[PDB]
Amino acid sequence: KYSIGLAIGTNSVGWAVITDEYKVPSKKFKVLGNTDRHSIKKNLIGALLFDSGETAEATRLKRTARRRYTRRKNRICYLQEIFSNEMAKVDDSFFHRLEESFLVEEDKKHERHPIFGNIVDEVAYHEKYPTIYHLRKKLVDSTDKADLRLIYLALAHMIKFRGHFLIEGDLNPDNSDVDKLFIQLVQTYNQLFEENPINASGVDAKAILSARLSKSRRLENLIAQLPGEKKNGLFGNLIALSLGLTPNFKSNFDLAEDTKLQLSKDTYDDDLDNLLAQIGDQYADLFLAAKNLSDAILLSDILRVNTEITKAPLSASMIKLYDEHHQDLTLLKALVRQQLPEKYKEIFFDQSKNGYAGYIDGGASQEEFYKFIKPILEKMDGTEELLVKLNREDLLRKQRTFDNGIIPHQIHLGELHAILRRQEDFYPFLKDNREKIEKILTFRIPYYVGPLARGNSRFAWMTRKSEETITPWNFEKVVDKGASAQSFIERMTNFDKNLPNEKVLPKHSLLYEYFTVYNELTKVKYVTEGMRKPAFLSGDQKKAIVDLLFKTNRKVTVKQLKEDYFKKIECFDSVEISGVEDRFNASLGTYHDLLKIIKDKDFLDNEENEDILEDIVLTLTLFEDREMIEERLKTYAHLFDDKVMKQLKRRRYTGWGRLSRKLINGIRDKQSGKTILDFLKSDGFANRNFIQLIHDDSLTFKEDIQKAQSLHEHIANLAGSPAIKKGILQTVKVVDELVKVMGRHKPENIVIEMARSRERMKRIEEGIKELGSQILKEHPVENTQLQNEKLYLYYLQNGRDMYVDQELDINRLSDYDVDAIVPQSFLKDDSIDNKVLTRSDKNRGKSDNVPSEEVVKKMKNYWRQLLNAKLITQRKFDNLTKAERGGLSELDKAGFIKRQLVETRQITKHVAQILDSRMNTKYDENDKLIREVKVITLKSKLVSDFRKDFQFYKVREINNYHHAHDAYLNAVVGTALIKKYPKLESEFVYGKATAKYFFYSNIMNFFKTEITLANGEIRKRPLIETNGETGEIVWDKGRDFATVRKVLSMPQVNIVKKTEVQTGGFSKESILPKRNSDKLIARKKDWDPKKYGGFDSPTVAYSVLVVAKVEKGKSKKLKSVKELLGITIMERSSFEKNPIDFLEAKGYKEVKKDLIIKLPKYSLFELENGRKRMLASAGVLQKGNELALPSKYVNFLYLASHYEPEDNEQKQLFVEQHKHYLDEIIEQISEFSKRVILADANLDKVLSAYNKHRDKPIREQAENIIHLFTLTNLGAPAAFKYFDTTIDRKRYTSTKEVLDATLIHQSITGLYETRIDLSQLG
RNA sequence: AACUCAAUUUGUAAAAAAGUUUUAGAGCUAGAAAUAGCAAGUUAAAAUAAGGCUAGUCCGUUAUCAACUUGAAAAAGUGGCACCGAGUCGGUGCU
DNA sequence: CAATACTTTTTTTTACAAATTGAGT
DNA sequence: AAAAAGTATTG
């Protein structure tokens, strides 16, 4: 008879076995291998360590980008294949040269100049066209014939870097002058508003709309020059459209629902046509001149510099940059020499220096270039004209930059389209493909169709209409984009928990909505004067109410039910209704939705079209792309008016239900034949409902449901971090093994415990914009300073107090307080979501609750604004104002303190279910569950407090035993608590308010001896705690506080580190230049790294013990070796397939194939004096020993560090009473390090530094000594400091020593071993 | 168990702009030579996990892994119990 | 050999679905 | 976003 405690985490799983005496047993264990010892003694406690589980994100993020690389590639293959035939007549080496452009002349198979094929014709090209964009403007403006190759260059360049698809629609070239397109709008506006014109006299539109300012600010600045017009006015909203915003036109026109417009969405066309069909085509000429403005503002929002009107504005802009870059560089050189010859070298030559040299040829960010060279131009004279060019980031611009991420594909297209429109007259195959080429640029695989696979992709759901190779041209005629677009969602959508072979309906199916109504209705009761007992509605009554009421009103009110039905129908003058209040919660909203559209109640009420409407709601719910919806609904084009169909593809539904069709109106009960909904429609006078129906054993619903229906697969399908799913998984195999260790005897209780900058910038940046506070200019900052909690809050609260309507001075934050909104006396939540910054934390009101109602009633409006700017959360807002909604009641304050001891978390409940399911597998006569084992769930408060309450302090930095100590105490506290209060097996095991408050507040008291309650009393519970009902003793406070104190002193604890073959990337991702080292890896087969460069630092999958021979010396004679060889992730599959051929290829002769031992990372070797080492790779090691530091030093270290009740003296005096423990600890460390660490060089720097600080206060040494365990911590040598004396790490950089050592194959608990002497090989 | 709202986490797809690496952008004068003085510099092609077979405008970095026997694989199978004590586990007795 | 010091890919957008928690009902 | 292995140069 025993029990198991488990402590579950991301990088650890602690475990312990205890007896009814709260003791941890020990056992002899058979030892395997070639060693002498065939047995060993171990304690049935321990832990398990492992590296964290990883999200499938980076893996995906790479993959997603591989497909982009494998498609931009084909965009060229498509383009080259076209030019191919007519290109041959000019140069049958051209495309072949572009391929081998990368190879060195010594390996090129054609002339070394790529574009033309001599050098005098090529050099002249680079002089006429210093940049590609020169060739772009030329191939557009000029009319003369052009060289076909020049053309492929300009075209592919636009295709290889096509720009983004965040804008929908065509952009018109001719739309270019802001100042004029604006004026033609005012004139167009004035045409309809002759009564109220707009005097745009002297309004610099080009200054206000094209400035490098926020879209909103440009609007506010533009309206500010129009005295009379409002921001959310029509013209206001119209400019808001031009600037790229999404305004609302409800108020301007007195409409019903909100009508929004965005010129970038695909809906603007149809969303405008829905508006003009509501205000009149008189305004069509308005929303167009507004668009032409957007098309001119986009450009000014794209070009860094302004320029002459052309047909290639982008390509012309960069020319104006190159020309300026050229212009301003000629100046600087000559400018610098004439005033700073002491530098010209370092600037224009030294690539190591972040000057103009390292700018171009080194790797100097545009930022790093300015940051360095700015004070120079400040020193000299005549540079001021260039300081401007710097501070707007227009000084020596490269053309291929990071800011070019804004360029939409439309800009590029208008140039690619132009070039074709020039040379198609000269080259006729162009005109034949002018569409075919532009399609390549504009084509883009929709997100909802997915990979263009053909059965070999587990990421694919696409359905092929044809069979042939998909191309950008036949995509519509080969891909059923639609049947695939529906698969896209149907994959992720859920199933019916009661019918796990049935998909669930959309949230707005008429069937679900009917089903809701009857389910609510079948529970209404009525009675009036003349009735013996309140009655139930019958089938005939319900069908009436749905017809007369629900299909006539969206919301059905009780007042309606009485005077519209019982009065006007059943002739009841008076009646009393039971089973519903105020109004019904249910509605047929989708029915009224359609009735307001198709305007034919006869068609809707007609039972024949039941299948149709659901498909309409499905199509509406299932898709999001208007083109994909109009396609799916044009099957009902012959059925509804075109005006209807138009207003039909504009309705949207979001949601997926929990229920299927086959459930409610599909399955039937056996002897009745009625469906569930049929039952809801009528059920004699039982009027049962859903929950009552799926359960009545009286009916054939229960059995047929419960007639429906791996391990690691079962866990990966849980919800939660993959890290915890790893720890959750390894938890079972531990329990499954420990059960075996205990002779297949299932335990009785299994206690478990589960452990609990850039982003901050935009958060504030956004919120401040919504409020227009110049606080940013008033107080600029940097995203690495927003870690200062207080400072982060000043900007969240926009510099004002959160409890008092007055401001805060940023300079005085140290004085200001950070108050818990809901106090940590109830739930702990040091998080921004439950904290504010106030000058005095006393202005919140009473400290025993939530901010007082006098605060809410004064600061609510400010808080509301903080929510409209997303500067607080609705949660935070909810708690800030709880007072006016009743505050935290004394009943509320009981759950907060109850939830400190009860695992509310779901993932934790799932583990308990899995364990309870694996243990309890026996069934009795009446088909009930036989519960051999009780699975207990605890929160980490129980033990974290238990330690502090009884001097069992934990210092994590000493070792990894403390994981195992926690799993122990969890078994202790968990079992003892169920023994004492067995009535709480409902809140802890799987299967007047102030009473609850003082109960859960004082539940763990029974361990304590002297109970001191804050209302002045001493109450001593006895020495032995016993159960009231059962006679079992549960806690002898004489023995069991030493039973535990001894267990935590045990020096042998099974610490096991999971042996893990390393997966992932091949090496470091950095591509390195050519150097002559055998360590570079070929980027491509035929790419000698010594010539082209390559990769470096490969990651090792595992190592192998390779006992073989090598050709030593000139005589090619064999010398026996016992080397340790590293298998890199890339080399892996090649090795496993045939290892002997793999090894001999490395110079390994006469390989003993039988002694190739696979050594994963963290493989464990033991050597002399019990020193243990772990493997990190073929030639690096890690420490493999734990320090069983005695307990008295632990608590002393804890207390001497935490020098922060009146029982603190006994604790605080003990410190200065046992100060000699210091030098004793330093000897505890040393005499250990000298034995298993072997950092003699570093150990000096510790003994030299501890001594040097002996004078320092007892606490300051207490702390900095905890740091010393870094020298002794299991794992990899890390760096650490003592006071301010850094101690860099000593690394074990040769694994040669473990080859004559002893290999330790550890079970998951480290109990079952297998010991291999690697000296007996060879 | 419902509903509403909001936040978090996980998982999939579609896109863009960088970055790096070789090559192409004839460097000129002087000096035997290293070295000096000048000139220039912004762009492009190509690769972007080696690569794989099932040959797709697809797949290639997540999850899972002690040893041994058995298996394609998933996975199954394999190691006695009590007491005393404790510096990483010893010692003792029993079948 | 041991000591020492340097390096290690990045940024942005669109679209969907599921739990899960936490506060209102 | 650091841990810590890979790499190189120096004692």
Residue numbers in the entry: 4 to 712, 719 to 765, 777 to 1011, 1031 to 1243, 1249 to 1366
Task: Quote the study on this structure.
In the type II CRISPR-Cas9 system, the crRNA (CRISPR RNA):tracrRNA (trans-activating crRNA)-guided Cas9 degrades double-stranded DNA (dsDNA) bearing a PAM (protospacer-adjacent motif) and an adjacent 20-nt sequence complementary to the crRNA. Two endonuclease domains (HNH and RuvC) in the NUC lobe connected by an arginine-rich bridge helix (BH) and a PAM-interacting (PI) domain are used to cleave the target and non-target strand of dsDNA, respectively. Remarkably, in addition to expanded PAM compatibility, xCas9 3.7 has much greater substrate specificity and substantially lower off-target effect at both 5′-NGG-3′ and non-5′-NGG-3′ PAM sites in human cells.
To provide structural insights into the molecular mechanisms underlying expanded PAM recognition and improved cleavage fidelity of xCas9 3.7, we determined the crystal structures of xCas9 3.7 in complex with a 100-nucleotides (nt) sgRNA, a 28-nt target DNA strand and an 11-nt non-target DNA strand containing either 5′-GAT-3′ PAM or 5′-AAG-3′ PAM sequence, at 2.7 and 3.0 Å resolutions, respectively. Since the two structures are virtually identical (root-mean-square deviation [RMSD] of 0.29 Å for 1208 equivalent Cα atoms), we mainly discuss the quaternary complexstructure containing the 5′-GAT-3′ PAM unless otherwise stated. Interestingly, however, structural superposition of 5′-GAT-3′ PAM-bound xCas9 3.7 (referred to as xCas9 3.7/GAT) or 5′-AAG-3′ PAM-bound xCas9 3.7 (referred to as xCas9 3.7/AAG) with WT SpCas9 revealed that their PI domains have nearly identical conformations. This structural observation indicates that conformational changes in the PI domain of xCas9 3.7 are unlikely to be responsible for their broader PAM recognition. Mutation of E1219 to Val disrupts salt bridges with R1335, making it possible for the latter residue to adopt multiple rotamer conformations. The relaxed R1335 in xCas9 3.7 also allows the side chain of R1333, which packs tightly against the E1219-stabilized R1335 in WT SpCas9, to move more freely. Taken together, our results show that the rotamer flexibility of R1335 is an important determinant for the recognition specificity of PAM by SpCas9. E1219V mutation in xCas9 3.7 promotes the rotamer flexibility of R1335, thus allowing xCas9 3.7 to have a broader PAM compatibility than WT SpCas9.
